[PDB]
Design a protein around this ligand. Structure first.
Ligand code: CA
Ligand code: CA
Ligand code: CA
Ligand code: CA
Ligand code: CA
Ligand code: CA
Ligand code: CL
Ligand code: CL
Ligand code: CL
Ligand code: CL
Ligand code: CL
Ligand code: CL
Lengths: 343, 343, 343, 344
């Protein structure tokens, strides 16, 4: 089928499958897996940080970072529509015993003044604000790119207050491709960055957290506690190395396909805004259709297209390596036929 | 001094001091303190609930209620400027491992539709919404009365979804006096209610939580875990009974004094809204002054008036039994003089 | 009835009742209650520490100390039969996220070598041992006194490893009176000490934690989070000052009464060991009786004597101010009758 | 290279596993669409006679999501005093679940049922609620000892009477089964949940599996999401797991035979070992009759080409597995014999 549900569905490339088969492994608990070690070295180097830590998921990456940055009772400033707040099972409260302090943002960009204002003064009644999280290519807003200036401004505020900064960079490479800002530049304004290998980069499993050596050591212990301490994970790291070093540039193709898809959907008559498509995501409203988002998703599936409804009136279409231009053209033929039926 | 910082500064009445001296006591851990037992019996009766639990503070009252209503990883819907979120040291995250889900409100009144939208659907990525908290006479907005209709609507939504409702009624009697709604009526739309004895009611220590027998049993065990299980606490309960049974009616005097204070401050030229003052609080804005809230608080202190800044531009003035009309008149003379200096 | 269940049942003396009624108070949240302030000053001075914190219960005292001494995932070494492990509702795990590391002891004295062995090496699999707790006049062993030499040796081990030491001194004054070791000497070999005012010292409510200024500041914030931040608690502190300054010497009377009780029970034929009784507790075994401990407790209750079973073959008898020699004599007459019935 | 007797965790993937992983049919596990993970879980559930199963990245996560699914904050978990959950899991039970461990000493990993019964908390405001009893099969610290089925049966009876959940940390449950002749489904029949490792003696590179009832597994799956174990195309790992479960269990007998040989021969040399206690893949060696300590002996072994771990200042643990052959054992023994001359 044509899977436009998310970039998480990407499958390993032939190069990855071969590398996994001949991957040199060792027990990572003893720090003896050579491939995991190289992946972490490469990740650190790539983001200009002192160290890196491989994790089974982006969620664990964010959570071990929060654990390594905070103490029980602390407060974490984050954007009101960020993944850490909405889609991580309330892990920050259970695992770290910290409270989120949602701050509204415009497509992932929290007004620096609102962030500064959300910082807690020192008083016995108040939690200590110890961390500020920023999500780049903010998902809920539709894969929008947070301006480098916004991140720089917030980094300055954090510095003045002695507050740590964490960038949820699950799709930071998509941000870099769209903005032209090198990932090292983003990373420089943060204490830690979590980036996914299993989404647009096509690795089957995992993410990586990069930051200072002491922070990473604390995160590695947190990883052990959470259950992310694997044995011969070099098999996964082999695909991870290829994802990090050879699958970044082509993300531009996903962006081009998403824009093309949006432009053509608008032409057909669907409620989409091509001008809002900055990375690999397209938001499709169903207000003008005879069935709502849930009913339309079912019609799409029957015709060979997979997508998710994010509300009763919205569907999200996401492009990635396993959605070629031919697939986009085929999907458009299907959307054309369904518009005749459901408009 | 003329202490307008909070109604918590109220000192025991002569009748309270004597009652504490002759209080009949016992070991509360064994449930043998007769005065604590009578206080809880009286509180439950007054609020139309099955049981009650005495606690050393309102913070503990709120926190044991959250513990008794939730499980780790749950989410708690509460108003964005509520005390549980801002002034309770992030306790909900540490003690219950729950995540707050802030919802904007108009003077403490969360739009029922927004509350409905904040409820989490059943999905692996989401925490379970198990509690909705409403604060009556919302502190931050200026001791504002939450409309009974608001509470009724939210109660209905909660019932629909099988969600618990907790009323932070620290100043519920102030609300009752101003609105004319009996506290028993407010309580009927909630599963639990925490009310303070140590604020406007003048008791030196404590609050009480009322609710169903099984919930109170869970709250009592939580109280033991938190360290609120005292011994001969009947000494405190003696004053509590008097606070509950003899100090409710006179709260009207505090409301009169607060309104008078606000009216006269407006005439002087200060940025206050007398029409918004319905209970014992007055929010004073410093945007039209030469110094901010922190600087003005210091000036007030030097002239005999104590108050707290609640932001860089807002000051909260609170009236209570230990601030007479004469004290208010004296404070106004001071405010008058300071307007000449800082306007 | 004749209450030998615990020393927690002690009621206020007339002097205490008068002091509570005339207590000079203030709002403790602002650090303005003069009596709480003097109690803390006196407590610190008496224990030779720079700071102190009044709390509603010994449980809260121990728990805020644990919170202030540890970080999530840490381990706390403690005696296998200590109160923090057995009678504090699993609070250490919930509030501080720490693991208890039980170490056997002989009448409360953990072998220093066993303590050194229980300290965790630096390994990713292990929690960090950050606290060692010692209970003085160890309850479960029968109110036994831990030798100063034991505490001194453990203190040295702790210093070598940079580990904190907390003394659960709920009954530290009983230990001091029996041993001749001043409480400031026990405390000199510890970082913090919690002692109760509501047991043998006869105050109706509360305990105090003593320690260094920074530690107490953290413990004070923990107290706020837990709900121990009261307002005009000076009413309680007034009785607390009398407990600390005037009720310590008479503890020798409780020790004398416990010894007399034990000697006479032995004379009757009960299985008691007068040689093990050095403070205010007597352990009686039901080994030579035709009933178990629980059945014996019931028989005692029906005859006018209250006590607690601590196992299926052992019951604990505790003396205090409210069980006079006359009461011990009357209890013995009852014990004599019951011995003929169940022996 | 060196003879690695440190642990069975160092086992490397077999040729068949490597090919199956690289060519694995995958899908997004978050959507429950990875076919290989689904088959691994189906097979695991079937093997243990349970309704459902959950793949996890580590045995630690397997145990922790089980504790989370079985308990509520403030609860107490009865477990053996020297069990892995208490000693080697970073205090996770306290941080993640807010529960207190209630250590019960055991005899060769087996807790006396009456001691377990006595450890259950009475209902009292001062006491946490006992909601879970955990049993470790082939108890590691005691030397990979096999807990009798009757011990587990008796504890199950006590738990049922009290309405308490039972979890078996079966990291090496297949080693227990091969040695005892007891099918793993029989051990599991007396438990609510069982966690077993695929990455130790079974030779898979990564992961473990938790088995149990449908509702419990659903709760454990949500816990797994919270802890960060919700992976995407994990079928790559599951492919090796299927082979571990289907083709690597029987040969564990070889690891046991190698460990028995090692123990018998070490005894013959003069080392303080008890061949009579060796029934699975572990040998405990005490350094009581050596002029060196445990850590010093480990260093000496390293210098001679043998890798082992000290588990006490006087105890070393030797573990056999697929990657240590009989010839490797003979080599280690010949070295042990000489080092006995130097340190005795
Ligand atoms: Ca993928
Ligand atoms: Ca008061
Ligand atoms: Ca008392
Ligand atoms: Ca007499
Ligand atoms: Ca392996
Ligand atoms: Ca050979
Ligand atoms: Cl290899
Ligand atoms: Cl912490
Ligand atoms: Cl009385
Ligand atoms: Cl829970
Ligand atoms: Cl006063
Ligand atoms: Cl595939």
């Amino acid at each position: 089928m044509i899977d436009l549900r998310s970039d998480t569905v990407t499958k390993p490339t032939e190069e990855m499958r071969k590398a996994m088969a001949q991957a040199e492994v060792g027990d990572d608990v003893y720090g003896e897996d050579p491939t995991i070690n190289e992946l972490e070295r490469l990740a650190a180097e790539t983001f200009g940080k002192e160290a890196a830590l491989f994790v089974p998921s982006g969620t664990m990456g964010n959570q071990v970072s929060i654990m390594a940055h905070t103490q029980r009772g602390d407060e974490v400033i984050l954007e009101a529509d960020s993944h850490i707040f909405w889609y991580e099972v309330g892990a920050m409260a259970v695992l770290s015993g910290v409270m989120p302090h949602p701050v509204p943002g415009k497509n992932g960009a929290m007004d620096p003044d609102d962030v500064r204002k959300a910082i807690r003064p020192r008083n016995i009644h108040f939690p200590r604000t110890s961390l500020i999280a920023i999500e780049n290519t903010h998902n809920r807003s539709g894969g929008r790119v947070v301006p480098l200036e916004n991140i720089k401004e917030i980094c300055t505020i954090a510095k003045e207050h002695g507050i740590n900064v964490h960038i949820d960079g699950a799709r930071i490479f998509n941000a870099s491709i769209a903005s032209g800002v090198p990932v090292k530049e983003y990373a420089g304004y943060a204490d830690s960055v979590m980036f996914c290998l299993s989404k647009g980069l096509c690795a089957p499993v995992g993410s990586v957290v990069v930051g200072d050596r002491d922070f990473i050591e604390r995160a590695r212990k947190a990883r052990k506690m959470l259950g992310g301490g694997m044995r011969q994970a070099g098999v996964l790291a082999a695909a991870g190395i290829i994802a990090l070093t050879k699958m970044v540039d082509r993300l531009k193709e996903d962006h081009e396909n998403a824009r093309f898809l949006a432009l053509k959907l608008k032409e057909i008559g669907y409620s989409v805004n091509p001008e809002d498509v900055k990375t690999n995501m397209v938001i499709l409203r169903t207000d003008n259709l005879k069935v709502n988002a849930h009913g339309f998703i079912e019609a799409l599936r029957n015709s060979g297209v997979l997508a998710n409804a994010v509300s009763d009136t919205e569907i999200r279409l996401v492009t990635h390596k396993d959605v070629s231009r031919n697939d986009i053209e085929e999907a458009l033929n299907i959307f054309e036929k369904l518009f005749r039926k459901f408009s």
